[PDB]
């Protein structure tokens, strides 16, 4: 997270940290608890990940510290990539983890609501992006989960700053024309959460963007409301 501040325990209970174990155990991506066995993250997080057995999902974490060998985790039973996904820039950057265990909810870990297809007429004023990612380019993974409040821009304005990319209906952008605050390496797959009318909603998945917190180059996020049916297809299966 570029230009962000530290979160407090309990502030983003839906934020998970997704680790891989081979060759090393490292932090890979963000992700969001959306149900008691379901993590919603980005498709791109799994390039060259060809087995769920090497994934650890850690919930209730504030500090990337907190973990080592006897810390609890959730195993990933199944990786579900959107069938049309090729690359981040191309869209469909959405994936579900079906966990093996069931997540118990509490003050350090709760699900975040998805948007309602009949609420794309809400304009969200209060959006944050969270993550353990770089604070600048050429940094390393952060110990403490960072936060940064970011304004949505319209897809029309986003399209003008990404000439030569099709900014589809199923993407949404957020950044300061100033620059200065954004996601960066390590925050991808993380949530883009918007408080509105008492409740938090999962509005975007951190997917791609030109550099990090760059002037006139807002981050691009999977627009989660355009995939709710897709999510419900996979998570409510018979």
């Amino acid at each position: 997270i570029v230009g962000g501040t530290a979160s407090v325990r309990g502030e983003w209970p839906w934020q998970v940290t997704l680790h891989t174990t081979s060759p090393t155990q490292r932090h890979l991506c963000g992700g969001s608890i959306i149900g008691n066995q379901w993590i919603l993250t980005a498709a791109h997080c799994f390039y060259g990940v060809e087995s769920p057995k090497i994934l650890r999902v850690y919930s209730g974490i504030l500090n990337q510290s907190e973990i080592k060998e006897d810390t609890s985790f959730f195993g990933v039973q199944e990786i579900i990539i959107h069938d049309q996904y090729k690359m981040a820039e191309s869209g469909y950057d959405i994936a579900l983890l079906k966990l093996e265990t069931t997540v118990g909810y509490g003050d350090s870990q709760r699900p975040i609501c998805l948007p309602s297809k009949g609420d794309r007429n809400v304009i969200y004023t209060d959006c944050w992006v969270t993550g353990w990612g770089y604070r600048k380019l050429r940094d390393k993974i952060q110990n403490t989960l960072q936060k940064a409040k970011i304004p949505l821009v319209t897809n029309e304005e986003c399209q003008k700053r990404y000439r030569g990319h099709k900014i589809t209906h199923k993407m949404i952008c957020a950044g300061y024309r100033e620059g200065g605050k954004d996601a960066c390496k390590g925050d991808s797959g993380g949530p883009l959460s918007c408080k509105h009318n008492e409740v938090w909603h999962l509005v975007g998945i951190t997917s791609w963007g030109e550099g990090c917190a760059q002037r006139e180059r807002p981050g691009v996020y999977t627009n989660v409301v355009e995939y709710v049916d897709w999510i419900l297809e996979k998570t409510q299966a018979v």
Binding site: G35, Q37, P111, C113, L114, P115, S116, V228, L232, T235
Partner: peptide
């Protein structure tokens, strides 16, 4: 408690 929800 969410209008869109994932049954456990």
């Amino acid at each position: 408690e969410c209008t869109t929800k994932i049954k456990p």
